[PDB]
Each structure stands twice: as structure tokens, then as C-alpha cells.
Ligand SMILES: Cc1cc2nc3c(=O)[nH]c(=O)nc-3n(C[C@H](O)[C@H](O)[C@H](O)COP(=O)(O)O)c2cc1C
Ligand SMILES: Cc1cc2nc3c(=O)[nH]c(=O)nc-3n(C[C@H](O)[C@H](O)[C@H](O)COP(=O)(O)O)c2cc1C
């Protein structure tokens with residue numbers, strides 16, 4: 001059984017990004033032998049999050065869940081041509097090579113199609129510094145497009161991205177450290 | 188009189204990044220007709236910061252100060268090959284073209300020299316989405332180097348960067364909107 | 375008198391990018407005391423360019439012209455979510471801190487609005503490694519938009535970008551080395 | 562049998578980058594059922610390369626070989642904080658989603674450790690615009706380090722990167738289009 005964790009980083013209530021992540025999570029679970037959690041970073045304790053205070057039980061649980069995941073869905077709205085500070089604050093408290101062995105699917109929504117590359121240029125290098133095993137294609141959606149109530153061509157791309165994410169999940173213990181630069185120094 | 192604002196984003200106490208920003212701020216003030224403030228993002232109210240709650244007076248004051256600055260010193264440690272979530276959380280609550288008319292100096296410290304480009308590839312595009320007028324060269328310092336108790340060649344580069352920052356400050360009202368894509372839609 | 379040099383990097387004949395650069399060059403020259411050249415990288419000798427062979431007179435002249443410019447207009451179509459290899463091949467043969475003291479205006483055309491950030495994330499850091507003094511806002515145009523036969527809002531942004539470029543040009547000998555990390559090691 | 566293609570992009574003779582790519586290619590071939598080619602972009606016809614002239618037989622063969630590869634080793638020296646124009650010129654003539662279904666290993670050498678992130682921030686997004694299936698961790702080496710005559714810790718990282726590359730190769734026809742946004746529009 002794969003353990004899939006979704007992490008969404010909008011600081012606003014009624015997040016369309018969160019709906020996108022939830023959609024992706026349900027899609028993967030309907031087609032694989034998986035369990036899931038959805039970490040809404042906005043629902044973590046702000047003081048504990050910014051201070052990396054792992055005596056906060058809910059924050060510690062979120063971190064542990066991410067560390068135990070076989071795949072991560074990482075979703076953010078685009079703020080100022082990049083990922084949210086809220087999402088990055090969460091990534092900052094994971095251990096150094098937290099993503100070793102893991103697959104990942106980067107998702108975003110934005111107000112403008114001008115900022116599609118924020119995922120590939122901004123978020124992707126961050127995940128690769130955490131030793132991630134396999135980050136599949138990014139998917140970005142413009143605000144308006146969404147309502148699976150979305151345009152056909154857009155829906156095909158999203159579904160293909162989520163399919164690829166699911167196909168890239170690994171059971172095998174041999175892959176657990178892949179992505180780490182020095183796999184015998186743990187992972 | 189120029190108004191200079193420094194913003195430092197380490198979430199850790201006893202921040203060397205903060206010492207770097209303070210050094211840069213003092214350097215500029217000793218050589219120009221300027222006033223300064225140093226916003227330590229860690230000292231802002233975490234809940235209010237993450238929620239963009241401007242009824243918090245100290246947060247509102249920080250935002251206003253940034254909006255009134257002629258120059259910004261933006262300093263962060265490198266976390267996960269990029270700027271901190273803490274710093275980005277602060278940038279996220281500034282208005283859309285908050286940096287129109289302004290000069291900026293990007294500063295960072297990091298544990299490894301491998302991540303020098305995090306400023307130019309990560310932070311610089313963020314400032315440019317906020318309509319910044321003039322971002323001078325980045326300066327990055329490796330942890331060890333610091334203690335102006337720092338290596339000669341390193342010190343020359345830092346000082347040149349801060350000099351350039353100071354020389355790039357503008358008094359003229361005509362430059363107030365430069366950097367904004369549509370300067371008559373305010374700034 | 376300012377010396378302005380435009381560099382356009384499409385490898386295709388009938389380049390709309392070239393027309394954009396020529397437009398920007400004429401705009402600056404009509405409003406400042408300036409001379410101009412337009413280097414079409416496609417018109418340089420391919421063997422000499424790829425080998426950095428400065429015994430080719432036309433290639434050497436192009437390099438010298440760039441080194442003597444007060445401002446550079448650097449224009450490229452977007453290929454594979456970045457600047458062209460053709461343009462980069464030219465930038466690769468300039469000396470290490472070739473752009474010290476200079477202003478620069480990054481321009482691009484692309485088939486899709488999805489790749490606007492290729493300038494800020496891809497080209498801007500390259501110019502900053504060459505010690506550039508002042509790179510103003512990027513301007514990107516989608517293929518269709520062009521024909522000053524272009525949409526009003528788009529035209530305003532382009533013109534504002536070119537205005538800012540012109541305003542940022544410096545006469546003063548004191549600015550000649552600004553941008554260089556060690557200005558007394560020449561520039 | 563996997564078909565592995567190495568592409569090295571230094572424009573200088575006696576390229577250490579080429580030696581790195583050749584080393585990686587031999588490493589993969591010694592541990593998997595594979596054939597290999599090494600495309601030295603410098604050895605392609607400069608005029609034909611810059612013009613994308615596929616009536617040049619050697620250029621056409623290189624492009625076809627890349628399109629038929631199950632894995633690509635893409636190696637470049639760092640020039641001006643990014644990949645070479647020479648390498649990018651070659652990538653520019655591949656079809657739009659040329660890398661669909663493929664694994665890739667990004668390699669670089671550079672004079673300074675300051676530019677490690679040029680791979681993750683610069684090259685990685687380019688490959689992802691070509692629909693690549695799986696790009697494993699980057700490896701960067703500083704000039705001095707090289708002579709497998711290299712430092713132990715450095716050698717471990719390189720070998721782990723190449724191991725991961727080899728493990729990520731896919732035989733299965735089902736993976737042939739993975740990475741493409743619309744896999745039924747070919748690949
Ligand atoms: C403070 C702020 C900054 C934003 N910056 C951008 C931006 O740089 N680019 C963009 O395409 N949209 C930007 N947006 C629009 C959001 O990305 C868009 O509304 C997104 O879908 C919000 O998703 P959410 O409901 O999950 O919060 C911004 C929105 C806010 C509130
Ligand atoms: C490339 C790199 C990545 C690092 N990543 C992490 C990390 O993810 N988590 C972490 O706690 N420390 C990380 N560190 C280092 C230590 O956290 C940090 O250097 C140490 O706590 C010393 O801090 P100080 O000497 O400035 O007080 C990293 C260091 C380097 C060089």
C-alpha cells in the first residue's frame with residue numbers, strides 16, 4: 001500500500017489550489033492501492049510552523065506524514081511569480097534530504113498564464129535540494145479555467161500529469177534512498 | 188533624505204544574516220543622507236503575518252515602511268536552495284507593485300558556496316514581479332567567512348555591492364514609478 | 375553621446391524578434407543623444423562564432439561594439455522555455471565582466487504566454503554574471519500580438535520598458551565599473 | 562537493449578566535460594544491457610547546426626539518435642552561470658516534445674563551486690519543456706577536483722547519480738510517451 005500525502009499552501013480560505021490538490025489525491029487513490037492525507041499548511045499553528053517547533057503535535061504529525069509518504073502532491077497558488085511563503089515555511093522544517101526515495105507532483109493555480117514557469121524554475125529546484133527521487137511534469141491552471149468541471153484540453157493535461165505521478169510511485173525497498181547524494185548516509 | 192529599510196528573514200535567533208543586513212544598513216547610512224529601519228520578520232506576529240492581517244499594528248507599520256522606502260536591503264539565509272518561507276511570507280503581503288521606484292540589494296548567507304545562485308535565480312525574479320526599479324548585484328556569504336571581521340576579498344565585494352546600492356538610490360520624484368509596467372496606474 | 379547596441383538572437387529569417395529590437399533601438403535613439411548598431415547574431419560567421427574565433431573581423435567588431443556600449447538591448451525568441459543557443463553562443467565569447475557599467479533591456483517574443491518568466495528566470499541571471507550595472511524590466515510579447523501596430527495595453531508596457539531603459543543610461547565616467555564585484559580589477 | 566546517448570557541449574578542445582560524459586556513459590554500459598553514442602556538439606557542422614539544416618547527414622543522424630535514446634546524458638561546462646550556447650543550439654533543433662519517455666542525467670563542470678545551481682535552475686527546466694520522463698539528480702564538478710581519479714566523496718556522489726540514471730531507464734513500451742502533456746498526440 002502506497003502512502004500518498006498532499007500539501008497545499010494557499011494562505012487564503014476557500015482555496016482553489018486546495019481543491020486541485022484534493023482532486024489529484026482522489027484521482028491517484030481511485031486507481032492505486034493507496035492511503036492519503038491532505039496537509040493544509042494554513043491549518044497548522046502559525047507560531048509553531050515559523051519556529052519549526054516540533055513539540056506542537058499537529059506540526060510534528062504533518063512532518064512525520066511527509067517523511068513517510070511514497071509520493072507527494074505539492075500544490076501552491078502563484079504569489080509574486082513564485083510559490084507561497086506559507087508552503088516554503090513548511091518545506092523549510094523537513095529534514096535535509098526529506099524527499100529521498102519519493103515521487104512528487106507539482107501543482108499550481110494562478111491568476112495569469114504568464115507565470116506557468118514558476119513551478120519549473122522555482123519549486124522544482126527546491127524539491128531537488130531535498131533529494132527527491134522523481135518529480136513528474138508540472139501542472140498549472142489559470143484561475144478562470146477551474147470549476148472535473150474544467151476545459152477538455154486542460155483536463156487531459158492534468159489527468160496525464162496525475163497518471164504519470166501514480167505510475168512513478170515505487171513499492172520496492174531498493175528505491176527508498178534514490179535521489180539522495182550519499183544513500184548510505186541514510187535518507 | 189533617503190529612507191532605507193532592511194528586511195532580514197532568518198527564522199533562527201542569533202541570525203548571522205541579520206548581522207549582515209545591519210552591517211549593510213549602517214554602511215549606507217554612514218555615507219548618505221538617510222534614515223533606516225530594520226524589519227526582523229521573525230519579530231512580527233506569526234498568525235497575523237501568515238494571514239496578512241493588517242489590523243495588527245506592527246505588521247501594518249512594517250508594510251507601510253517598506254512601501255515608503257527609497258531602497259530595500261533584502262537579506263535571507265539560504266534554506267533548501269532558496270530564500271526562507273519566512274521572508275517570502277512577508278513579501279507576499281506587500282501590494283502588487285510595491286517595489287515600483289525602489290532600489291534593492293539582495294544579501295544572503297549560506298552553509299555552502301554551492302548555492303550562490305539562489306539569489307539571482309530565486310529572489311531576483313520575485314522582486315521583479317513587484318515592479319522594482321533597480322536591483323544591484325547580489326552578495327552571498329558563506330557562514331564560516333563571517334565574524335567587518337571577514338576576509339579581505341570577500342569584504343571588498345560586499346562593500347562594493349553596498350556602495351553600488353547607495354549610488355543607485357534616487358531622490359527625484361520622476362523616478363518614483365519606474366519599474367512599474369503601467370506607471371500611470373499608480374505604483 | 376550614448377552608444378546603444380541591440381543584439382537579436384533568432385536563428386530564423388524574417389525574425390519578429392529582430393523587428394522588436396529594431397523598434398526598441400529606434401525608440402531610444404529618437405529620444406536621446408545616441409548612436410546605435412544592431413547585431414544580428416544569425417549574420418555572424420557560424421564557425422567563428424562557435425569557436426570564439428576573433429580573427430574573424432566581423433565577429434571581433436561585434437564583440438568590441440558590445441564592450442563599448444553604454445546600453446544593450448538583448449532580444450531573443452523563446453526556444454524550449456529559454457533564450458536561443460544562438461544568442462547564448464554570442465554572450466559566451468564576451469569577456470568575463472563584459473557588461474560592467476552597462477544598462478540592459480531584455481526583450482523576447484514567444485508563441486505562448488506561458489513562458490513570460492523565461493526572461494527573468496533564465497536570461498537575467500546570465501547578464502548578472504557578466505557584471506551588468508542595471509537591467510530594467512523584461513518585456514515579452516506573444517507572436518500574434520505583433521504587427522507600433524500592436525494592442526494598446528501591450529504597447530504601453532513596451533514603451534514604458536524602453537523609456538526606463540533610456541532613463542537608466544549613464545554618461546558619467548564614475549559609473550563605468552558599477553556592477554563589477556571588484557571594480558579596480560578593471561571591468 | 563537500452564540505447565543510451567551522451568551529449569557534451571563544451572566548445573573547447575580537450576574538454577574535461579566530455580571526459581565526464583564519457584565516464585558516465587561507460588559506467589552505465591558496464592552495468593546494463595545497453596548500446597551508446599557520444600555526440601560531441603563541437604564536431605557537428607556549425608552552419609548546419611545554427612540553421613537547423615537537417616540535410617546535413619551527420620546533424621540529422623545526431624538528432625535521430627537523440628530521438629531514439631532511452632536515456633540521455635546531457636553534459637555541459639558552465640559558461641556565464643549557465644549551460645553553453647553550443648549545447649542549447651543542439652537542443653533547439655530537436656522536435657518539440659523530443660524527450661518524451663526518456664530518462665536524463667544532467668552533468669556539468671565549472672571553474673567555481675558557486676555555480677552548482679545552474680543545472681537545477683537553468684538546464685532542468687529546458688529538458689522539462691521537451692517533455693522528458695525522468696531527470697535524476699544533477700551532478701556538478703569543479704575543475705580542479707577532476708583527474709575515476711577524483712576525490713572519494715565527490716566520486717561517490719557522481720557514481721550514485723549515474724546509478725540512479727541507470728536504474729531509471731525503462732524498457733516497457735507503456736512508458737514511451739510519459740512526460741508528454743498529451744501522450745496520444747504522439748511524442
Ligand atoms: C498576494 C497575491 C499575490 C498573487 N501573485 C500572483 C502572481 O505573481 N501571478 C499569478 O498568475 N497570480 C497571482 N495571484 C493570483 C493567485 O495565484 C490566484 O488567485 C490563485 O488561483 C489563488 O489560489 P487559491 O484560491 O488557492 O488561494 C496572487 C494572489 C494574491 C492574493
Ligand atoms: C546545502 C546545505 C543544506 C542544508 N540543509 C539543511 C537542512 O535542510 N536542515 C538543517 O537543519 N540544516 C541544514 N543545513 C545545515 C545546518 O542546518 C546548519 O549549517 C547548522 O545548523 C549551523 O548553523 P549556524 O552555524 O549558522 O548556527 C544545510 C547545510 C548546507 C550546506
Ligand SMILES: Cc1cc2nc3c(=O)[nH]c(=O)nc-3n(C[C@H](O)[C@H](O)[C@H](O)COP(=O)(O)O)c2cc1C
Pocket residue numbers: 092093129197198199201202203204205264265266267268269296297298299300301302330
Ligand atoms: C533548515 C535549514 C536549511 C538550510 N538549507 C541550506 C541550503 O539549502 N544551502 C546552504 O548553503 N545552507 C543551508 N542552510 C545553512 C544556512 O543557510 C546557514 O547556516 C545560514 O548562514 C544561517 O543564517 P542565519 O544565522 O541568519 O539563520 C540551512 C540551514 C537550515 C537551518
Ligand SMILES: Cc1cc2nc3c(=O)[nH]c(=O)nc-3n(C[C@H](O)[C@H](O)[C@H](O)COP(=O)(O)O)c2cc1C
Pocket residue numbers: 016080110111112143281282283284
Ligand atoms: C500576475 C498577477 C499578480 C498579482 N499580484 C497580486 C498581488 O500582489 N496582490 C494581490 O492582492 N493580488 C494579486 N493578484 C490578483 C488578485 O489578488 C487575485 O486574483 C484576486 O484576489 C482574485 O482571487 P480569486 O479569484 O482566486 O479568489 C495578481 C494577479 C496576477 C494575475
Ligand SMILES: Cc1cc2nc3c(=O)[nH]c(=O)nc-3n(C[C@H](O)[C@H](O)[C@H](O)COP(=O)(O)O)c2cc1C
Pocket residue numbers: 384385386388389390391392451452453454455456483484485486487488489517653654690
Ligand atoms: C525550435 C522552436 C522552439 C520554440 N520554443 C518555444 C517555447 O518553448 N515557448 C514559446 O512561447 N514559443 C516557442 N517557439 C515559438 C517562438 O518563440 C515564436 O515563434 C517566436 O516569436 C519566433 O520569433 P522569431 O521570428 O524572431 O524567430 C519556438 C519556436 C521554434 C522554431
Ligand SMILES: Cc1cc2nc3c(=O)[nH]c(=O)nc-3n(C[C@H](O)[C@H](O)[C@H](O)COP(=O)(O)O)c2cc1C
Pocket residue numbers: 468469470471577641671672673704
Ligand atoms: C565564475 C567564473 C566565471 C568565469 N568566466 C569566464 C569568462 O567569462 N571567460 C573566460 O574566458 N573565462 C572565464 N572563467 C575562467 C577561465 O576562462 C577558465 O577557468 C580557464 O580558461 C581554465 O580552463 P581549464 O582549466 O578547464 O582549461 C571563469 C571562471 C569562473 C570560476
Ligand SMILES: Cc1cc2nc3c(=O)[nH]c(=O)nc-3n(C[C@H](O)[C@H](O)[C@H](O)COP(=O)(O)O)c2cc1C
Pocket residue numbers: 466467503571572573575576577578579638639640641642643670671672673674675676704
Ligand atoms: C567563456 C567561459 C565562461 C566561463 N564561465 C564560467 C562560469 O560562469 N562559472 C564557472 O564555475 N566556470 C566558468 N568557466 C569555467 C569552465 O566552466 C571550466 O573551465 C570548465 O570545466 C570547462 O570545461 P571544458 O573543458 O569541458 O570546456 C567559464 C569558462 C569559459 C571559457
Ligand SMILES: Cc1cc2nc3c(=O)[nH]c(=O)nc-3n(C[C@H](O)[C@H](O)[C@H](O)COP(=O)(O)O)c2cc1C
Pocket residue numbers: 390454484485486517655656657658
Ligand atoms: C510552448 C511552445 C513550444 C514550441 N516548441 C516548438 C519546438 O520545439 N519546435 C518547433 O519547431 N516549434 C515550436 N513551437 C512553435 C512553432 O515552431 C512556431 O510557432 C511556428 O513555426 C510559427 O512561427 P512564426 O509564426 O513566428 O513564423 C512552439 C510553440 C510553443 C507555443
